[PDB]
Design a protein around this nucleic acid. Structure first.
Lengths: 299, 267, 244, 63, 83, 215, 236, 223, 237, 126
RNA sequence: AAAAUUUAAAUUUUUUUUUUUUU
């Protein structure tokens, strides 16, 4: 399972960056357009950026909490790749490296960051809590998965609602779904990750001892773009201007002064897209309630 | 195994060691061991540490961490856990040596768990934690040696309060600076090998390769004891054995054992 | 609420350090001649690492083989006695660890002159003994020894250090107590430059410090590869003066 | 007897005479020249003088 | 159950579509492709039925034949060991 | 948990209960497994303790690894139904198993060929109101019968006898020992530990050869 | 009168001619006139070392010789190979260096000599003459494009070992001379490889022939007549 | 007939199809013929490996059998001699349940076959015939039979049924049965009645389908 | 309103006709019957062709099936001696190409190409079941050195039926409008590969973006303005 | 026959005959990949025209060959030959199982009765 | 004043599920 590209094609794109061109039609520092569409279920969404397609799912159920944090509920994200999304991939390799490179990000992007209040999953302390689940599916790759799965999970959390609960010791009263309403969830902050994609037009030494910074960085590598890149970097931020994570794990060497200059441009990008989610969550729920207005008057 | 040697040697090696005036490839006396180095007390986060150096550059370190436990709800008061570099958990030589030293340090066989006893209700869970960097040998008898020094390099914090928690059920208290050495009589392990009518001591890897069969003999308390296993080294040259040769090696170990011990019983 | 004292208004840390100070830093070369031609030992404070390098040599299988360059294997050994509290289970496929196993590869894809070592294998062995926090940059400094410890072809020194942030104030060379106390960043710094190999942030960081925060660690990192150099050199003098 | 055999010459064109002659004659003949080698593992070998010397220094197993 | 279809070529003297049950014997398990598996409780009951038809057709009658062969093989075993 | 199996809901637990010279005996049978080429069946029952176990042969299987001059043995011990011996407790015995047969099998007759040995510690009673050490010698016997059934070149009907936490394996009608195993016991009881093992070995090998030559 | 060296040291991890000594990442100079060879990389002037080693300035050639590394194979050298593998008509064999040497099928002394000519049935008997791990005398012919080199046995003097014992050393301490087979009082012979591999054996007549049957060149036999006074003199 | 489908909706994959019946959304993907692995080849026929991802949870045993019965159905659909020493990985995604996965698996088994049939048409591999699957239930209390039930009707269903048929000659002749998944309590007598609608209905399904294929692909075809 | 078909339909033509088989139809090796086994539209070869007609189904695919006398574009991936390792499509099986199948065929002369090159070649010999083989130079070239290794250029992937129309069809409007702007080269590969080199990378991107878009939209009449717009998108500058 | 290379041919060992017919089939299960496999190299098919060898014109997958052992080779496989006029192809079905049974027309050729189709196989002398 | 003189670089597959580290 190996992608084969000519070195002639390798120089071609490398030339295009040397004349400030890229094959998609975007700018270097331009991001794709995002299509968000929900299914009928809560925590159901289809997210699409041109060629890359994803789908995720949020659910929850009853379990006991750990001994470790006996206060808090349970939550984890599955991101199992299927070779459906591209023939590179093993059947569910949870031990591949790029998978881990997809994993630990979303592990830190959600779980260690804590966008979601796990303490608001405590139904009863130590007895019964929530087990909230996030199964990420990939559909078709043009890269940006780890940015797409960044979004589509956080999209899904802002669309899921959990049903109604009443406690009497052991008499724990899960109510019928349609009499007593499902209840949405508590998001502390909304993180958005950004892939950065790096291209030395030169050898090693002109990056190493060539003092002249000459390295091109772009956003959202397409599939062919992604196969030649030299370093890998993802930052994540919010609306309140705090930096969630940064991960440059090796690759090409890279100036620090670039990275701050990189990460500022992230901010203006992610903010506009964030609010686009925020209206569409409202507007769909508005469309839910206008169709709820088109239901009770109908019934 | 580790090495791949040539057949023309393998005769000569099986020739020279099966001499009736028996000859080692390094020509030691048949009961000698090889020179080593023994370091401890260097992991100051640990209850005890250990560091031992072989002549062929085989290399291990065994760590000592303790833990206070109820000695009634738990049977095994003393746990061994081993790591060999370069190998899977699933491999054979890992697990057998691992399961061995548990038997060697059963809680009342050569282990004096009364010295481990904290209260009438509580005691000390210990962890024999082993990291072998490298070996070229069936490594086992090396590994006991550092552990012997490791137990001789282990201090434990002092009890303050009383020790009868049946009625009053006190939660036991330790001083924060005052440690006491674990008094203990740890055992020792020796690798043997049988060639023809000769029995070498400390088989080196070449000596370990050519052998017909070999032994492991548990020494404790100034004597022979269990666990004792006949043990294959290779599997291309496995021959059977007269029992008096098995009867020979025991005192052959024993009349040279404490001199090795006293060399290490030396402080 | 912490019942302790993070950083004094009088400028001091837990051992009394200033914000711009290091732990005791000790390396060693040829610690294990009988084991491999790369053998180096690190003490950076109580972070104690045995570092081992095998190669350049034949693979175990012809499948794992290239006709262009070398390969690089990372095997990390975190012991269950590495910490104060003894960890229960083993780590040998823990997804936390595999990340670093990915990480050091891509950090060291680009120092090794890979083309001039084709059809051969480089294996880097890690033994984490005593763990003192600052754990990530502790590794990389041990690596930079071990490649030179056999004298493998390379470009440059590569330095690593975790530097932490208590509210406004940078902390060079934090410990694990301070690591659980605040926000920290580790920097994989290359040579004398201002270019980065590793950059990793887990904790939550306000944006505005970060340029200044990044501007801190370079002077630390330059003093790192400083202290590596002479310490090798005084070893390097010890060879030929008594070889010849 | 399945043996190999060296036919010598000082001139390429001496060999070019003898090669195409023997090539017509027995066929399975290797030619070795600074200009052109043909059929290196043939049974019969025709080559100039120094090539033997050259492949006597570095020990051709051809020999 | 297994249903096969037959070659004219393969005969040795001492369409044509045969039902076999009690299947075993790797050669059978390789080469039978339309198959039937049935659960049944002895009074004519049926817990499940399992058709994979990959070789022959299936008649309505091999169905009924297997059904006829179902209620025998089960009911004997209900009565065989009388537990 | 384990995504590959059905282990129930996690919060369940299994059920709990509380308190409210002798003869050994065999029943040895071969030729009853059609996957294998060597099978052997062993019943054992002795005084509080009844034990049954299965030894399975696959050979000679091909080796995808490389060339060898000769054969190679592979031995598996697996828990059956009730008794659960420890994992690391198992393979130590598997180590002790292979050493003896490497003084048994003509591997030189079998270049580049494998030996697969599956041992199923199927069911054991211990109704008695070093627990693995009491089951060692019966393994060797159970293997030997299955290895005769695959008909592989074996030098001797080698067997082990037991005397009170001690296992000693013989050949040549006991005139040499091929496998030694000792736990705690007495001190210098070895000479009596020669004897009671030997006579059980003298018993057992006769029981074995009856199982085959009379068939 | 002892068994083992047990000397103790507790409480510590460890016990604790002028030329240019340069480091990786370090500038040598930027005189453009110098030539740039081994241990050297650069950017158009900046002469940059890559190892821990010494500056070697040869008359206009600057290059860096390291101090640490594996054995460097060179042609015409007299070393010892341990048989790694068998290929198509090829063999793999350890030098101790970076990679294996290769060894052609007809690169070896045939029993009966050249009168035994070629045969395709010989590849059906590769394992006959040679097998794994075995030790021999080998002659370094020539290389490949990388730096991996090959061997042969163009003499009776080169061939498969017997009659003694192997030992091994670092490759550094072995000094170069015009001769490598050496014969020592005690009727014995060292076969110093260059690469760090050392074979001892009893002096043969062919060894005696150096200073005044042929069908035994793949045997695992020794001289059966080996005294202990031979054998113990080996160990000294 | 509230069914609907999409063809050719992935990019890097040979065959792709979204099948949407009344409540369940399922997409299937087909990649083949491509390079097979070492342990996977057949010297003669075509090797097939099939992956189904659920909507919820991960791949376990409940998934495994729905995979494996679906292995059985495709094997005669494929002209398997045409691709020796080859591999076609086919992968299915459950996106919507439309049925209680804890209690049922019925509709998905009908759905995924109806899904994977169309992505092969996208894939354009040598095939043999035409096919269809429907879910059929029999109510516990009413004792009547519904073709294409719902999950609440499944709760009061007594027995759940999936029929897979092989359709030829304009998809009209039942060439063979592929799968009959009889589950729940049933007798002799219901069963021939149980075929007898699905004898019609799956053809009535394919009668829709024959149109749909050409409508999607003849503009993809050139004139 | 065509000769549309399914696998499993009634085959139209009478059995007693001498008929050369085209692809898409399969004859039974077991029962000698012949059936359409693929999806799409039949196109019957009309009468008069020596009394021998031919059936073929238009089927759609992207995954190319190697077949003989077919011009494809390949990638040098390994130097298996005497005989190249070459691939034609990612994740597919590699192809073997002789070192000697070359227009100056010379066995003492070993050619020069290296791992990662693009070469133009025709499938010479390929069983359905065997390691397939190609040729640059052929006997059916008739000593023509018309195939060969390529220079740098640019290669784009399309689906196969489109690439047929690039080869088989002059009504295919693509080559018209492209020649109507700049002058350049084109190699056509039946493996869905289209290799183009221009005088300019600038126009090559203009060449790139059209062919991605046009083959996507697959509407040959619309390709007039769509092609010309990308020039303006390059002449945006 | 397991797999056909341009280099060579790969089979698995199933049955060994004997001297003065008497046989010994292996009792193994190939579906584990258990059995011993061997390799016929393509130049070792026959000696007549041993250079310009066309491998497909003698073998197809799954077919039965009376072949002679050359030697051991490696541990992985075998060195094997058919290079005689009495050796070679024993039996196969048409189109590799996709059709009926095929009979060796000559020693040098093979047809099938009902079909009217022939194929080139290096058949054994019958 | 002629005459002529030198090379040679390596090919086709063996493995065990994810916790869990001190506000």
């Amino acid at each position: 399972k190996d992608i084969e590209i000519s070195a002639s094609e390798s120089k071609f794109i490398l030339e295009a960056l040397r004349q400030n061109y890229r094959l998609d039609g975007r700018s270097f520092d331009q991001f794709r357009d995002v299509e968000i569409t929900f299914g009928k279920e809560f925590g159901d969404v289809s997210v699409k950026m041109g060629n890359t397609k994803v789908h995720c799912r949020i659910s929850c159920q009853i379990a006991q909490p750990y001994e470790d944090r006996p206060f808090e509920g349970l939550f984890v994200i599955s991101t199992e790749i299927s070779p459906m999304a591209g023939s590179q991939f093993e059947n569910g390799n949870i031990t591949g490296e790029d998978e881990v490179l997809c994993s630990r990000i979303i592990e830190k992007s959600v779980r260690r960051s804590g966008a979601l209040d796990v303490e608001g999953l405590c139904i009863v302390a130590g007895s019964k809590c929530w087990a909230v689940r996030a199964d990420v599916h990939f559909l078709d790759c043009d890269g940006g998965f780890i940015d797409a799965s960044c979004i589509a999970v956080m999209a899904g959390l802002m669309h899921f609602k959990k049903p109604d609960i009443t406690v009497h010791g052991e008499q724990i009263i899960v109510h019928p779904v349609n009499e007593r309403e499902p209840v949405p969830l508590g998001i502390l902050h909304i993180p958005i990750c950004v892939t950065f994609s790096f291209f030395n037009p030169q050898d090693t030494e002109e990056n190493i001892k060539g003092e002249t910074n000459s390295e091109i960085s772009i956003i959202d590598a397409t599939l062919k773009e992604e196969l030649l890149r030299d370093g890998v970097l993802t930052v994540t931020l919010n609306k309140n201007r705090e930096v969630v994570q940064v991960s440059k794990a090796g690759g090409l060497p890279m100036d620090a002064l670039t990275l701050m200059k990189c990460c500022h441009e992230a901010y203006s990008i992610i903010e506009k897209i964030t609010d686009q989610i925020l209206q569409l969550l409202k507007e769909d729920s508005e469309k839910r309630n206008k169709y709820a207005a088109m239901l009770t008057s109908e019934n | 195994g580790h090495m791949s040697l040539s057949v023309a040697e393998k005769s000569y090696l099986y020739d020279s060691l099966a001499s009736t005036p028996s000859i080692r490839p390094d020509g030691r006396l048949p009961h000698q061991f090889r020179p080593i180095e023994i370091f401890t007390d260097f992991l100051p986060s640990s209850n005890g540490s250990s560091r031992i150096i072989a002549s062929d550059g085989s290399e291990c370190i065994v760590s000592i961490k303790s833990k206070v436990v109820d000695h009634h709800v738990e049977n095994e008061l003393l746990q061994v856990d081993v790591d060999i570099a370069g190998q899977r958990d699933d491999a054979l030589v890992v697990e057998t040596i691992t399961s061995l030293l548990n038997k060697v340090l059963k809680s009342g066989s050569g282990v004096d768990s009364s010295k481990l006893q904290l209260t009438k209700k509580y005691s000390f869970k210990i962890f024999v934690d082993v990291l072998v960097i490298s070996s070229h040998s069936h490594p086992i008898s090396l590994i006991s040696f550092a552990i012997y020094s490791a137990l001789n390099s282990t201090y434990l914090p002092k009890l303050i309060s009383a020790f009868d928690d049946l009625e009053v059920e006190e939660l036991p208290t330790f001083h924060d600076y005052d440690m006491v050495k674990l008094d203990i009589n740890p055992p020792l392990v020796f690798i043997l090998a049988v060639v023809g009518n000769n029995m070498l001591l400390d088989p080196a890897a070449n000596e370990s390769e050519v052998a017909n069969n070999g032994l492991i003999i548990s020494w404790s308390n100034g004597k022979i004891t269990s666990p004792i296993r006949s043990v294959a080294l290779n599997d291309s040259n496995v021959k059977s054995f007269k029992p008096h040769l098995l009867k020979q090696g025991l005192a052959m170990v024993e009349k040279y054992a404490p001199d090795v011990v006293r060399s290490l019983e030396n402080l | 609420m912490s019942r302790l004292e993070i950083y004094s208004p009088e400028g001091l840390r837990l051992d009394g350090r200033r914000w711009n100070e290091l732990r005791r830093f000790e390396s060693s070369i040829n610690t294990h001649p009988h084991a491999a031609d790369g053998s180096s030992y690190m003490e950076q404070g109580n972070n104690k690492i045995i570092t081992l390098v095998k190669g350049p040599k034949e693979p175990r299988l012809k499948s794992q083989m290239d006709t262009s360059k070398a390969l690089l294997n990372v095997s990390v050994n975190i012991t269950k006695f590495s910490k104060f509290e003894r960890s229960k289970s083993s780590h040998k496929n823990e997804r936390r660890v595999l990340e670093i196993q990915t990480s050091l590869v891509r950090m060291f894809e680009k120092n090794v002159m890979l083309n001039i070592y084709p059809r051969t294998v480089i294996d880097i062995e890690i033994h984490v003994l005593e763990q003192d926090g600052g754990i990530m940059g502790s590794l990389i400094n041990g690596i930079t020894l071990a490649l030179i410890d056999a004298g493998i072809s390379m470009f440059d020194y590569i330095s690593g250090i975790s530097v932490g942030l208590y509210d406004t104030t940078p902390l060079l060379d934090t410990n694990s107590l301070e690591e659980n106390a605040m926000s920290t960043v580790t920097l994989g710094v290359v040579g004398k430059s201002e270019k980065l190999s590793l950059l990793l942030v887990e904790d939550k960081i306000p944006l505005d410090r970060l340029e200044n925060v990044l501007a801190i660690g370079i002077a630390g990192a330059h003093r790192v590869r400083d202290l590596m150099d002479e310490e090798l050199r005084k070893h390097a003098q010890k060879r030929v003066s008594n070889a010849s | 007897n399945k043996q190999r055999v060296i036919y010598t010459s000082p001139i390429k064109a001496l060999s070019n005479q003898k090669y195409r002659e023997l090539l017509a004659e027995f066929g399975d003949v290797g030619l070795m020249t600074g200009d052109i080698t043909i059929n290196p593992d043939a049974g019969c070998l025709v080559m100039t003088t120094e090539i033997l010397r050259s492949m006597l220094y570095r020990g051709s197993e051809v020999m | 159950y297994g249903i096969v279809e037959l070659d004219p070529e393969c005969q040795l003297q001492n369409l044509n579509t045969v039902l076999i049950a009690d299947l075993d014997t790797e050669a059978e398990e390789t080469s039978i492709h339309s198959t039937i598996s049935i659960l049944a409780a002895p009074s004519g009951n049926y817990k499940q039925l399992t058709l994979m038809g990959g070789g022959a057709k299936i008649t309505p009658e091999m169905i009924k034949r297997s059904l006829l062969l179902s209620r025998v093989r089960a009911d004997d075993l209900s009565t065989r060991f009388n537990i | 948990q384990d995504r590959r199996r059905l282990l129930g809901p996690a919060a369940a637990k299994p059920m709990a209960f509380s308190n409210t010279e002798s003869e050994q005996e065999l029943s040895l049978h071969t030729g009853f497994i059609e996957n294998c080429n060597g099978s052997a069946l062993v019943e054992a029952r002795s005084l509080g303790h009844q034990t049954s176990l299965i030894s399975a042969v696959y050979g000679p299987r091909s080796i995808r690894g490389s060339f060898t001059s000769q054969g190679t043995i592979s031995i598996q011990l697996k828990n059956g139904l009730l008794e659960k011996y420890n994992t690391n407790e198992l393979k130590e015995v598997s180590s002790f198993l292979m050493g003896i047969f490497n003084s048994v099998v003509n591997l030189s007759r079998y270049p580049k060929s494998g030996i697969d040995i599956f041992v199923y510690l199927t069911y054991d009673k211990d109704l008695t109101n070093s627990q693995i050490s009491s089951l060692i010698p019966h393994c060797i016997t159970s293997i030997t019968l299955a290895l005769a059934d695959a008909g592989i070149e074996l030098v001797d009907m080698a067997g082990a006898g037991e005397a009170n936490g001690t296992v000693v394996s013989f050949i040549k009608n006991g005139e040499e020992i091929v496998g030694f195993w000792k736990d705690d016991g007495d001190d210098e009881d070895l000479l009596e530990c020669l004897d009671r093992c030997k006579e059980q070995y003298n018993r057992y090998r006769d029981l074995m050869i009856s199982c085959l030559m009379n068939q | 009168s002892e068994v083992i060296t047990i000397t103790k040291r507790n409480g510590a991890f460890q016990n604790s001619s002028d030329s240019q000594i340069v480091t990786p990442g370090e500038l040598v100079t930027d005189d453009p006139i110098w030539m740039r060879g081994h241990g050297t990389y650069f950017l158009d002037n900046m002469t940059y070392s890559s190892v821990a080693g010494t500056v070697s300035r040869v008359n206009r050639l600057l290059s860096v010789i390291p101090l640490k590394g594996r054995y460097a194979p060179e042609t015409g050298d007299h070393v010892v190979g341990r048989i790694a593998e068998v290929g198509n008509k090829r063999w793999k064999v350890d030098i101790g260096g970076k990679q294996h040497a290769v060894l052609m099928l007809g690169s070896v002394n045939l029993p009966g000599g050249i009168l035994r000519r070629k045969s395709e049935s010989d590849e059906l008997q590769m394992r006959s003459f040679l097998k794994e791990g075995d030790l021999l005398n080998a002659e370094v012919q020539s290389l490949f494009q990388d730096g991996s080199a090959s061997l042969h046995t163009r003499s009776l003097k080169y061939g498969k070992l017997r009659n003694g014992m192997f030992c091994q050393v670092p490759s550094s301490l072995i000094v170069r001379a015009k001769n490598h087979t050496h014969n020592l009082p005690g009727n014995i012979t060292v076969v110093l490889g260059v690469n760090g591999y050392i074979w001892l054996r009893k002096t043969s007549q062919m060894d005696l022939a150096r200073d005044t049957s042929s069908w035994q060149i793949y045997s695992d036999e020794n001289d059966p007549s080996i005294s202990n006074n031979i054998r113990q003199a080996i160990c000294r | 007939m509230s069914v609907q489908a999409e063809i050719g909706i992935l990019d890097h994959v040979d065959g792709s199809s979204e099948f949407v019946s009344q409540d369940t959304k399922v997409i299937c993907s087909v990649t083949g013929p491509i390079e097979p692995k070492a342990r996977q080849e057949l010297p003669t026929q075509l090797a097939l490996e099939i992956i189904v991802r659920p909507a919820k949870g991960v791949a376990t045993t409940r998934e495994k059998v729905l995979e494996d019965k679906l292995r059985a159905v495709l094997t005669p659909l494929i002209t398997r001699h045409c691709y020796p020493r080859q591999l076609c990985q086919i992968t299915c995604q459950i996106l919507e349940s439309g049925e209680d996965e804890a209690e049922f698996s019925l509709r998905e088994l009908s759905c995924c076959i109806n899904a994977a049939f169309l992505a092969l048409v996208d894939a354009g591999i040598a095939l043999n015939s035409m096919c269809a699957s429907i879910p059929i239930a029999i109510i516990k209390d009413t004792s009547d039979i519904i073709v294409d039930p719902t999950a609440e009707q499944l709760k009061i269903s007594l027995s759940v049924h999936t029929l897979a048929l092989e359709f030829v000659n304009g998809g009209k002749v039942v060439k063979n049965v592929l799968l009959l998944d009889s589950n729940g309590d049933f007798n002799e007598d219901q069963l021939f009645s149980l075929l007898e609608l699905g004898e019609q209905k799956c053809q009535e399904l394919v009668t829709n389908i024959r149109r749909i294929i050409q409508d999607n692909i003849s503009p993809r075809l050139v004139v | 309103m065509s000769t549309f078909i399914f696998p499993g339909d009634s085959f139209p033509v009478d059995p007693t006709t001498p008929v050369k088989l085209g692809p898409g139809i399969y004859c039974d090796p077991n029962t000698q019957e012949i059936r359409p086994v693929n999806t799409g539209v039949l196109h019957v070869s009309a009468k008069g062709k020596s009394g021998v007609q031919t059936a073929y189904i238009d089927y759609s695919s992207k995954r190319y099936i190697p077949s003989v006398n077919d011009f494809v574009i390949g990638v040098i991936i390994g130097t298996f001696s005497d005989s190249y390792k070459v691939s034609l499509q990612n994740f597919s099986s590699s192809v073997s190409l002789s070192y000697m199948a070359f227009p100056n065929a010379s066995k003492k002369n070993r050619p020069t190409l290296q791992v990662g090159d693009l070469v133009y070649a025709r499938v010479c010999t390929a069983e359905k079941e065997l390691e397939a083989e190609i040729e640059c130079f052929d006997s059916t070239t008739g000593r023509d050195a018309g195939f060969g290794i390529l220079e740098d250029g640019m290669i784009i992937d399309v689906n196969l039926n489109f690439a047929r129309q690039l080869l088989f069809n002059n009504d295919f409007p693509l080559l018209k409008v492209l020649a109507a702007h700049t002058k350049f080269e084109v190699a056509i590969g039946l493996n869905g590969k289209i290799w183009v080199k221009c005088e300019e990378l600038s126009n090559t991107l203009a060449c790139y973006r059209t062919i991605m878009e046009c083959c996507q939209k697959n509407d040959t009449a619309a390709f007039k303005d769509i092609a010309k717009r990308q020039f303006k998108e390059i002449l945006t500058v | 026959v397991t797999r056909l290379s341009l280099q060579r041919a790969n089979v698995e060992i199933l049955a060994v005959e004997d001297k003065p017919a008497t046989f010994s089939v292996s009792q193994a299960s190939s579906d584990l990949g258990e059995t011993f496999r061997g390799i016929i190299r393509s130049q070792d098919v026959r000696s007549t025209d041993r250079d310009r060898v066309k491998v497909i014109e003698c073998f197809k997958p799954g077919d039965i060959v009376r072949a002679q052992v050359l030697s051991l080779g490696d541990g992985t496989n075998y060195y094997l030959t058919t290079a005689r006029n009495d050796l070679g192809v024993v039996f196969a079905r048409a189109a590799n199982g996709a059709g009926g049974l095929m009979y060796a027309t000559d020693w040098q050729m093979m047809t099938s009765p009902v079909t009217g189709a022939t194929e080139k196989r290096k058949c054994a002398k019958p």
